[PDB]
Every structure is written in structure tokens, then in C-alpha cells.
């Protein structure tokens, strides 16, 4: 259950990471509100997760979800290079996350 919370926080991570660049110098209203709401939601869920989850696992899995979603959305939405190297890195990241959830 805390893992569900962790995954959702990792989602909001990438949503605010990309709305931050779509917002300019924190100037565009809609993207700035999206970033602020996403930051608050993400950090809150991360805290509630770390209450019952170890900090060393929760932090790195949150970072992994964030960067994985960033690369998913970059390859899909920004025509970013879909390198085979990037594919195998995504495999490494996902296997790490799932294996960390398996040994709970």
C-alpha cells in the first residue's frame, strides 16, 4: 500500500518536472499551478510513504520512477532518441524497482 503511494508520488514527480519547463520563469499561470500542485502532492505522498518505508529504498525508487517517466515522456512527446542503450537502461531501472518491491 505504501508502495502504491510511492508509485503515485513518482508519477507526480515527472508531471511537475515537465510542467516546470513548460512554465517559463515560473511565469505561465496554468503550468506554474500544475508544478506547485504537483510538487506539494508528490512531496506529501513521499513523506507518507517514508513513514512506513525505508528512506534509502523510498528515495531511490521515487527518483527512478521520476527519471523513467521523464525518459518515457521525452522519447514519446519530444521525439527524443530511442536508443537501444536507453531501452536497456530502462530495463535495469524497472528490474531494480520491482526487485526492491519483491524483497519487502
Amino acid at each position: 500500500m505504501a508502495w502504491l503511494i510511492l508509485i503515485i508520488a513518482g508519477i507526480f514527480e515527472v508531471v511537475w518536472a515537465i510542467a516546470l519547463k513548460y512554465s517559463n520563469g515560473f511565469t505561465r499561470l496554468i503550468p506554474s499551478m500544475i508544478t506547485l500542485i504537483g510538487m506539494l502532492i508528490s512531496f506529501y505522498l513521499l513523506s507518507q510513504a517514508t513513514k512506513t518505508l525505508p528512506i534509502g529504498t523510498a528515495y531511490t525508487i521515487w527518483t527512478g520512477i521520476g527519471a523513467l517517466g521523464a525518459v518515457i515522456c521525452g522519447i514519446i512527446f519530444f521525439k527524443e532518441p530511442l536508443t537501444a542503450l536507453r531501452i536497456v537502461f530502462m530495463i535495469l531501472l524497472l528490474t531494480g524497482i520491482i526487485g526492491l518491491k519483491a524483497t519487502s
Partner: protein, 87 residues
């Protein structure tokens, strides 16, 4: 922004408005500046949040021609919008 109109005017105040755009154009804030058209002393100014499209300017000398400029957060939008108006 665009369409800087003086909606209302008493001898000592101007109620102004502008078009905020739509959705992907709403900025976080606008900055209104008002001063005697061709003065020598510091201009007046305030700032309103981006969701509002109107603003009230108060405390003006009656019968004087003032200029009003509504500014965007940065320059990368739609250029300053300025008007002149005598009370």
C-alpha cells in the same frame, strides 16, 4: 496581454481592463503602471495576479492626462499595452 481599456473613470480614479488570453496564455501576474503623461516625478505602479483581467487605479489628480501601461511578467509574450486618458 491586449485591449487596455479604461472601463470606468471618476475625476480621481480609472478602472481598467485587458484581455488575459485563454488557457495557455494566462500568465501568473500583470504589472500596472500609471503616471502623468509626460511627468517629472516617479511614476506609480502596482501588480495584480494573472487570473484577474481588470485593475483599479486610484488617487489621481483630476483633469490631468495620465498614461497607463499593463506589463507582462517577461518580454516573451505580447509586447506592452499602453493607453492615454485624461480624468
Amino acid at each position: 496581454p491586449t485591449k487596455l481599456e479604461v472601463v470606468a473613470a471618476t475625476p480621481t480614479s480609472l478602472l481598467i481592463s485587458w484581455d488575459a488570453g485563454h488557457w495557455w496564455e494566462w500568465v501568473t501576474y500583470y504589472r500596472i503602471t500609471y503616471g502623468e503623461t509626460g511627468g517629472n516625478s516617479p511614476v506609480q505602479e502596482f501588480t495584480v495576479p494573472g487570473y484577474s483581467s481588470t485593475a483599479t487605479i486610484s488617487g489621481l489628480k483630476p483633469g490631468v492626462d495620465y498614461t497607463i501601461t499593463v506589463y507582462a511578467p517577461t518580454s516573451d509574450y505580447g509586447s506592452p499595452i499602453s493607453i492615454n486618458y485624461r480624468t
